[PDB]
Structure formats: C-alpha cells, structure tokens
From Swiss-Prot:
Ubiquitinated by the ECS (Elongin BC-CUL2/5-SOCS-box protein)/LRR1 E3 ligase complex and subsequently targeted to proteasomal degradation. The gene is PTPN14. The active site is at C221 (phosphocysteine intermediate). This is Tyrosine-protein phosphatase non-receptor type 14. It is linked to Choanal atresia and lymphedema: A disease characterized by posterior choanal atresia and lymphedema. Additional features are a high-arched palate, hypoplastic nipples, and mild pectus excavatum. Influence clinical severity of hereditary haemorragic telagiectasia (HHT). Induction: Up-regulated at protein level by cell density. However, at the mRNA level remains the same regardless of the status of cell density. Residues 12-280 form the Tyrosine-protein phosphatase domain. Belongs to the protein-tyrosine phosphatase family. Non-receptor class subfamily. Protein tyrosine phosphatase which may play a role in the regulation of lymphangiogenesis, cell-cell adhesion, cell-matrix adhesion, cell migration, cell growth and also regulates TGF-beta gene expression, thereby modulating epithelial-mesenchymal transition. Mediates beta-catenin dephosphorylation at adhesion junctions. Acts as a negative regulator of the oncogenic property of YAP, a downstream target of the hippo pathway, in a cell density-dependent manner. May function as a tumor suppressor. Interacts with FLT4; the interaction is enhanced by stimulation with VEGFC. Interacts (via PPxY motifs) with YAP1 (via WW domains); this interaction leads to the cytoplasmic sequestration of YAP1 and inhibits its transcriptional co-activator activity.
C-alpha cells in the first residue's frame, strides 16, 4: 500500500501548490537591514531572525550576518541539523568560511554548478600551480578530488590563520542538475545522497559512543531553498521510509518552511522528491 500510495500520488501539483511559502508571522530584522541587502543573493529569500546563523561580529560585518538558517528536525530519537545557505557571493566567501569554521562543519553539500545556462549560481569559494586560496582569515587548500560524473567529492584543508588550527572539510558537489526542470538520472541523485551519508558517518566516527553534538552539514544551491530543499527533504523522507515513521511528505515540507522560507521552489522539484523516494523503495 505505502509504495502504491507514493506511485499513485505522482495529484502532487495541488498538494504542493497548497503549502504556504513561509511562516505567517515571520521576523527577519537583521536580514532586512539595508547593510545586509547586498549579502543576500536573492533579496527576497532570507533567514528568520530566531534561527539565522549568527557569525561572531567583525568590523565590516557588525551584525555577523550571513544568509543561512539552522534547520533542525527530530525524527523519533534521531536529530538532524543542517545549515541551509545561499551560494556564496564574491563578497561573502570569507563569511561562508567563518561560518563553516565557527559551526564545526566537516561537510558541504553543494547542489549546483557555479554557472548554469550562462547565469551565476555560486561563486567559486574553493581553490580552482597553486592549490590554495585565502578567504579573509581562512586558508583553504584543495588536496584531492574524486569525480563520479554525477557528482564530485573534494577534500579541502581549512586553516584558521589566527590560531594555526586546521580541519579537513569535505566538499560534495552535485553536477547533474539540468538548466531547467529536474534530473532525469534519479539513481545518480540517490548515489549523491549515499555519498553524503558516507562522508557524514566517517567525519563523525570519533563522536560515536559519546554525547558530543554532531555538527551540522552545510547545504547550498543558489538561493539556498530550491535544490537545497530537495536534498534535505529527500534525506529526511528516506530516513522516515527506512524506519517506517508516520510522516507525510507535505507535512515534512511545512516543517522545513517553518525554519527557512520557500524550501522547494517548483513542482518539478517537489515531484523529483517523490521520484527519489519511489526509486529508493524500488532499490530496496
């Protein structure tokens, strides 16, 4: 029945179109400040005040503003923490790396190419003879890369220049999203999700059997809501399916939109989540 229910739905237009885009009484005071307008790629997509990612203020960035949201979801006993953010701008790369540093992030899931159809989606905030670049106070060095065609996994070393401390950050870039619509290769997106799962596990291995808080993974696309929402909703719903949790897809999307406005921007994106879930169940 469960499988037949998902396949049948794929009716989804009305289900999607009915879900509110944002919290009714949303507050976004810091994001709305004129000084923070230029820090948003798409002005209309901003974090709610209560769960924006707060950077330690600096002289140039006195509110410690970055267009990024803490997304926290508990499913049964399991707790998920993502930071959903925009593709960095040329003038926010240093903010991005400050965030990754301060939040203890080990994994970045970038669900976009830098440029698509001649349109900029994200700045190149990791190194392209020299394999390093310094963004503000953070030196980033590209160490290795595995290209799996649909996606590529790059190992980065990030050094906080003030303290000399270093961390490995894993950068997982999905490269198969077409200019319009959604990927035809659903299997490749599932494999990308598997790669994220793999990397999160190995980066958190030394926390196993402790009460240490698992750090968030960063998820971004262009504005940090469309494909970013697809990834997060897919991971959560796959978990729900694996553990037979009684959670409906549209209700989980509502929960996500209460934490970051506009998550999942198109019907094609929403339908794609269903395609991902159906293929996951078929694979199982």
């Amino acid at each position: 029945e469960r499988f037949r229910t998902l396949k049948k739905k794929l009716m989804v237009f009305t289900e999607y179109e009915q879900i509110p885009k944002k919290k009714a009484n949303g507050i976004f005071s810091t994001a709305a400040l004129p000084e923070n307008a230029e820090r948003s790629r798409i002005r209309e997509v901003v974090p709610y005040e209560e769960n924006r990612v707060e950077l330690i203020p600096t002289k140039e960035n006195n509110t410690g503003y970055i267009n990024a949201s803490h997304i926290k979801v508990v499913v049964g006993g399991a707790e998920w923490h993502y930071i959903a953010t925009q593709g960095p701008l040329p003038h926010t790369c240093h903010d991005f790396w400050q965030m990754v540093w301060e939040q203890g992030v080990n994994v970045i899931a970038m669900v976009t190419a830098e440029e698509e159809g001649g349109r900029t989606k994200s700045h190149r905030y990791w190194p392209k003879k020299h394999s390093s670049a310094t963004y503000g106070k953070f030196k980033v060095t590209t160490k290795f890369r595995t290209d799996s065609v649909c996606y590529a996994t790059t190992g980065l070393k990030v050094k906080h220049l003030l303290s000399g401390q270093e961390r490995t950050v894993w950068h997982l870039q999905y490269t198969d999203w077409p200019d319009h619509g959604c990927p035809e290769d659903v299997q490749g997106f599932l494999s990308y999700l598997e790669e994220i799962q793999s990397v999160r596990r190995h980066t958190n291995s030394m926390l196993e059997g402790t009460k240490n808080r698992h750090p968030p993974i960063v998820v971004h696309c262009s504005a940090g809501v469309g494909r970013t929402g697809v990834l997060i909703l897919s991971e959560l719903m796959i978990y729900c399916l694996e553990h037979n949790e009684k959670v409906e897809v549209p209700m989980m999307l509502r929960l996500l939109r209460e934490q970051r406005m506009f998550m999942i921007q198109t019907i094609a994106q929403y339908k794609f989540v269903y395609q991902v879930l159906i293929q996951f169940l078929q694979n199982s």
